[PDB]
């Protein structure tokens with residue numbers, strides 16, 4: 001039984017791994033909020049999805065990419081006019097081998113997160129085990 | 131076999147439970163469009179997701195939160211400039227006990243729904259049964 | 261084991277089937293990038309989701325609808341002000357019979373896709389087999 005769901009707590013900005021520190025669900029404890037990464041324990045097929053809230057008045061361009069280790073497997077850009085919020089979101093279905101790390105990276109832009117209201121999220125679960 | 135998928139039909143606005151009355155899928159009949167709520171029958175792990183379309187020229191701020199009973203478990207805000215649409219969307223993975231209610235609440239803002247075209251949606255399914 | 265995940269490569273615009281030609285995952289080879297369609301082989305319950313990136317400065321209105329054969333089962337509209345990107349996204353849970361085709365159609369608007377960076381995506385998997 002492998003499944004997790006976490007949210008973002010503070011304001012996030014610049015190139016970095018988005019660490020979702022508000023962990024709601026984490027069967028098997030495979031998501032590490034100190035790294036922001038999901039580690040594959042069982043070879044198989046996995047679904048992942050993320051929703052990242054962006055602040056307006058921020059230059060204006062926020063990138064949030066789902067990575068499998070060092071490879072971009074999904075991308076999203078958020079960007080809005082006068083003073084406004086928007087979402088950079090995407091979903092994947094990937095095959096993973098034990099040790100593979102899955103996580104969201106922030107490239108530039110202002111990402112909003114709340115103490116415990118989960119406007120920005122990261123979740124996933126295994127669909128098939130090999 | 132627990133899974134549902136419903137859409138929104140009319141214009142929705144103000145604080146209220148978003149009742150998705152255009153039900154496409156509803157295995158086990160656990161989603162009630164007269165309440166807009168999904169009721170857990172089987173203890174286990176559940177995935178939920180929602181996409182809510184917002185109208186522009188509307189003041190401009192629409193909140194749509196997924197709730198498990200009286201608790202906010204996911205949030206989204208939509209908001210756009212001159213005359214424009216956008217989405218408040220999010221996804222969760224939650225553990226539920228029999229009786230738990232899962233649903234979307236609208237906080238302020240103009241939510242669009244169509245008679246039978248499903249621009250605004252609510253869906254979910256059980257991943258693991260305890 | 262039925263699951264797929266594909267992205268969009270070039271710029272897409274006008275009424276047409278969105279062919280996601282950057283296929284990452286495709287168990288059972290049921291997604292055809294030459295048609296852009298997923299063909300049901302096994303009667304059962306299926307989850308689908310799509311994220312379509314739209315360019316700003318484009319008139320400004322992009323529609324992307326998930327279709328089951330010739331029927332609209334989900335809709336999304338993207339639309340943004342000065343020079344800006346946004347997403348038309350939605351998710352479904354549907355019952356399918358062998359032969360049913362599931363795919364995204366583009367109605368008007370500028371859809372962005374990248375050679376191999378997957379800003380615009382299409383994915384899905386079977387939840388229950390009948």
Ligand SMILES: [Mg+2]
Pocket residue numbers: 065072075377
């Ligand atoms: Mg990228």
Ligand SMILES: [Mg+2]
Pocket residue numbers: 117195202205
């Ligand atoms: Mg809230």
Ligand SMILES: [Mg+2]
Pocket residue numbers: 079080085086209210215216339340345346
């Ligand atoms: Mg926008």
Ligand SMILES: [Mg+2]
Pocket residue numbers: 086087216217346347
């Ligand atoms: Mg948006």
Ligand SMILES: [Mg+2]
Pocket residue numbers: 087089217219347349
């Ligand atoms: Mg979305």
Ligand SMILES: [Mg+2]
Pocket residue numbers: 247325332335
């Ligand atoms: Mg339509």
